[PDB]
Amino acid sequence: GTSVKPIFSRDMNEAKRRVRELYRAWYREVPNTVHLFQLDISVKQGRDKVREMFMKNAHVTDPRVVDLLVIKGKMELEETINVWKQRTHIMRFFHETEAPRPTDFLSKFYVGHDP
Amino acid sequence: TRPTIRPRNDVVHKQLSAFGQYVAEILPKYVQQVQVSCFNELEIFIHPDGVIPVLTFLRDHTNAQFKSLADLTAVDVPTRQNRFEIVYNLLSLRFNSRIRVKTYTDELTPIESSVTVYKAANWYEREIWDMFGVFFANHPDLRRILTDYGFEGHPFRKDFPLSGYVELRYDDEVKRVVAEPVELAQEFRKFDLNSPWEAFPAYRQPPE
Amino acid sequence: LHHALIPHGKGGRSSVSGIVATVFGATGFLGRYVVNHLGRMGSQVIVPYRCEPYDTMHLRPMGDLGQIIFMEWNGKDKDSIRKVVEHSNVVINLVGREWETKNFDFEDVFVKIPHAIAQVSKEAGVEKLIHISHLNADIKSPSRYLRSKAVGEKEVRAAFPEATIIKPSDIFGREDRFLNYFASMRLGKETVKQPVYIVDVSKGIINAIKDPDAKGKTFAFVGPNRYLLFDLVQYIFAVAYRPFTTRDKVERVHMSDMTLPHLPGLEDLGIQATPLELKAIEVLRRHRTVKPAKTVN
Amino acid sequence: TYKFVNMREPSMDMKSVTDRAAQTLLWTELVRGLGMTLSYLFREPATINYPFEKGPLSPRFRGEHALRRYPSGEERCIACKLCEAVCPAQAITIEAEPRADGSRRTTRYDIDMTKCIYCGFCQEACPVDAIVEGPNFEFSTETHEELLYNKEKLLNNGDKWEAEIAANIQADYLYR
Amino acid sequence: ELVQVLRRGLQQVSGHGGLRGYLRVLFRANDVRVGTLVGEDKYGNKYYEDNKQFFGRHRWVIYTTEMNGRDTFWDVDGSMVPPEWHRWLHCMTDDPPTTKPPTARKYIWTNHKFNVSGTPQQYVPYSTTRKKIQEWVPPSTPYK
Amino acid sequence: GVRTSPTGEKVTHTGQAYDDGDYRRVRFSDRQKEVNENFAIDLIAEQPVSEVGSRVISCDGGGGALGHPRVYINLDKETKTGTCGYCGLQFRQPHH
Amino acid sequence: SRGEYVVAKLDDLVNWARRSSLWPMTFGLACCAVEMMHMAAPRYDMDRFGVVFRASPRQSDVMIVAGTLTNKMAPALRKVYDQMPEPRYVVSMGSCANGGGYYHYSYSVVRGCDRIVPVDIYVPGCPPTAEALLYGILQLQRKIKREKRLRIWYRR
Amino acid sequence: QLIAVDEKLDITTLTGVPEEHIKTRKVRIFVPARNNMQSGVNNTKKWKMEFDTRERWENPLMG
């Protein structure tokens, strides 16, 4: 039961197809984005960041969530291609100015009360 | 009712009730409820599937001809199964009257775009998507209109924090504006203003 | 620990890290990075200055409200030094001039001022002191620069026993004089150089402040790769797409870089040094209008 | 009722056509605008000689904040926290405790003037005329820190501006 | 006619104490108008009125050359006006503090101060509350 | 009634003063500290006690609508005097 | 000696020249720009002090921030500030620019323009009157008069 | 026209919340207790959701 209305895909396979299309488009766009924005990162680590962002949502098991994430990624790609962003928006993906938050129990115990 | 009380108009109430009944009769497939408020406002509750038919009927019908889209917005009510309600405000110049149409949806159910019916609905639907995350199908170009580029989340949702999650500053080491987790020197003070001893008996709910 | 100095917050702009640092010579090339690193984590920085406040304006947005204080001082007076380091628990010495002025010679800059600063900091009860000297600072050096640096290091170590000496190796960065001077020319094959990144030095200073066991130790901050001067200049000119300071700087740049494996380095402070190949474009992109240089190990 | 702004029909007789042609060829309206500007040059300018001359103001003007006190010399504030509750910008911070003589008085009263919107809601919420918005507006500052007022600064402002504040209140209190 | 305007110009030159005072006022206030004296300030400010001028220019002040601690021959600002003359000068009332003075209070400042931003007399914010939590003090005597 | 700290700072009417080991004193070096010289407690202590021949007196702070809300004070307890909750003025019945 | 006298006199001359002709560019972000334009109105006449109306960013001496700075807008403001010739000053006008003001606790508002650029003068108000902004400009002029660059170069 | 999928609803990846503010917090679901200072019961009708209390410290400036 639990009948719901499709957004774009009827099942998971079409969702995977759209995900692969978006990943292909991003993988093409990475070098041109790196050159045009005069970024200090390399193409390798930019594509690694794209891979990491795609892996961040690897646990989704619902076509509606999957293709809505695809829609948001397509919006981000459109923003990046049309040079609507500045270097700051692109560089925000890397968090180069944020201190590295430790994970072990001792470090969190020493720094403060935050688990 | 001495001068401090607002005057009530009986004629407009009857006219709006009659027109609401008329609209309900003509479109039983979608209309779920019709209401007229004590300050003479007519709002119509419809099923989500009937957004295009109801709007087209109200715009094009000779007796209605609501040619002007006054406003389109959304309201977030987390306690409902359908989280968001979509409100259309229409103005009729021919008959000098205003009508309201309400719809509902959730995070994952798209709503049909009404750019074909009203050209004004374009930026309104863009703003609804930006602020609430409600997707609109068959929209010419749906994208953020108010938030910053790369902004994550939808701020007009009730569970979004007032100050957001990230703030901006300039860093001299990287020579650019950066985004960092938000820290406030003074936390926003939260006030508990709601009092006991209910104010309006007419709105008292059953004790269930 | 004086409760008002107990760390609080999540290590951000408006947090409290319990560090009240006085950064002498904070208006220089390394001073801005040191102040920025100190201020991004909520510590208070007292910035002593002799220059027009207009030249100190760029340090204003590096800290939250009230976290950065600017005071006037001069090296020839001890009262100013006392009133600047009176409430600080950390003192960082970054004072240095690469040429000789008519009012401040290498002796004054590198011996008398650091000695007075260390003496007043010890007399005032300052817990930690960090002093900066050159890697090539040896007493028998032909150059007055390194001779004065060695004498100042000796006298500071005598005055402040718990002081930490840091010996960077010809720092390079966006506002450096290494790459900027080498790109402004528009001799070699016997001199080997060991450049070190500016951010690496800043993080090393911050970690030395945080590290408890680095009290009386001496550190040598060096980069990953050793380069001969000729091919290093070749790479610098290649990055800038260009076809290939009175007396002391030339004899210092033709002089080779020392190697002191016994002294602890950046890796002992938990820092992975960044190769010059990554930041060469960052530094030299403004000099315009691939084939990295060979190294010796 | 409604009017028409651009619903005229130009006359097509020979004299009107010749008049329009003369207007086109001799630039009559341009000369008329020139004459307007020339005439407007020969009239007295509206500039005042600031800072030696000041712009007119009213007893109702909202300027820099101040804390007042009774003629006996004790401060009027009683730490009711109505001004802090009503503040639209959350610019007031208040802490209180009993005094050594048992009076209800504040120990902290801060107003962040970089958050304040100068709406005046605080002085109209005050039941004892303690917090007011004085007539001073020439208090620009070179640093962000000096615009964060504490209780001592506000009491000093009250002692500094009491004469003008009292005169303005005497002028305007019958409208409140 | 023109002779009349030149005569009024010479009267303006005469009314400032001669050419020396005329140059003084011209180079200090960029104005050479003469008006009736309204009153004298305790710090040396002079106040004039001329009801024949249009609204806004009918009142003005000639600032003193030496206020509390600095030389204000050239460096004058609007914060040097005391509160009563501040009220009169901004047209908040029609009565100068000479005809009717303000009410006298013991706590009112006897010496008005101008804006002291960028001066060792500047205001420095600080907390005015006491410490909330008291720490435990270990004994000075040993346990063993 | 301004006092001075043993270190040298002025003590405010709220009693605030940084202790010796406090680093936050550095904000006042090359500058000053804002302290109001008139203490309200001392000023209100100098006011004479009013003598009225009634058991209940009313106080509004003086000035009619320019004072505080009008309150009534009971003066039956001869041990102490009646004190206004807003203005701090003291009233007393004519004992002896 | 004469060495300090000549540099002092030249420094006074340069300071007088720099403060007698201030060319501002205005970021009219919000309703503080209305008071900015009212300070250019005939009553106050900023031009009569040597302050020109709407100078280009390439030859502007002082930046006036008049309105709320949002997160979406901060990079552009920083970029414009970077493109200014070195003898530059920043005036923060209004509560929104000073400390975020009435939108301080917002998810899209920069809590003070001094997070992005250094600020020389803070003009309080919501909005500050055109006369208050004129007072701020004159205070900036006095601050420029106070500086001493040739003396510092001589004693160094 | 209908998926008729069977799985629990999860919109976590779409809300934009940071990673460490999702699985680390602990929300509380309760009906607020009546304020004993007053006898009114109108504030004890609905259900409230609130998060766990985190660190609050004193600002070095202005306290």
Ligand SMILES: CCCCCCCCCCCCCCCCC[C@@H](O)O[C@H](CO[C@H](O)CCCCCCCCCCCCCCC)COP(=O)(O)OCC[N+](C)(C)C
């Ligand atoms: C021919 C060769 C040229 C070579 C290059 C030189 C360029 C030409 C030289 C002429 C420059 C003009 C200088 C005159 C400036 C004095 C202006 C005076 O009126 O200002 C007063 C005095 O201000 C300063 O004290 C004056 C400092 C000027 C320097 C003094 C003499 C410098 C001459 C040195 C020349 C040597 C040049 C060598 C290198 C080429 C105060 O006014 P201010 O406060 O503003 O405004 C207040 C507004 N109020 C009054 C309404 C309240």
Ligand SMILES: CCCCCCCC/C=C\CCCCCCCC(=O)O[C@H](COC(=O)CCCCCCC/C=C/CCCCCCCC)COP(=O)(O)OCCN
């Ligand atoms: C039997 C003997 C006959 C001998 C021949 C003599 C006969 C001459 C009769 C006619 C001559 C008049 C010609 C003078 C110039 C005419 C140019 C003209 O009319 O062009 C205008 C345009 O001219 C302008 O508008 C230019 C104005 C630009 C603004 C500048 C302000 C100028 C006004 C200030 C006065 C200038 C004073 C000039 C004298 C200078 C003294 C040295 C047409 O433009 P439109 O109205 O858009 O219509 C065409 C499209 N359908």
Ligand SMILES: NC(=O)C1=CN([C@@H]2O[C@H](COP(=O)(O)OP(=O)(O)OC[C@H]3O[C@@H](n4cnc5c(N)ncnc54)[C@H](OP(=O)(O)O)[C@@H]3O)[C@@H](O)[C@H]2O)C=CC1
């Ligand atoms: N290659 C390099 O850059 C590295 C430098 N060395 C040492 O590291 C320290 C910092 O280097 P760096 O920042 O690049 O040098 P900079 O020239 O950039 O600045 C040196 C600092 O010292 C201050 N200063 C200089 N002279 C005096 C003085 N007579 N009185 C008071 N203050 C003075 C300067 O202030 P102001 O401008 O106002 O006078 C300035 O902020 C220096 O001690 C330098 O010698 C360490 C290894 C190499």
Ligand code: SF4
């Ligand atoms: S004027 Fe308005 S915003 Fe300012 S402190 Fe008073 S109530 Fe708050």
Ligand code: SF4
């Ligand atoms: S200033 Fe007035 S409103 Fe505010 S706490 Fe004091 S008495 Fe109450």
Ligand code: SF4
């Ligand atoms: S500072 Fe005040 S007046 Fe200016 S734009 Fe913001 S709210 Fe409006």
Ligand SMILES: [Zn+2]
């Ligand atoms: Zn009373």
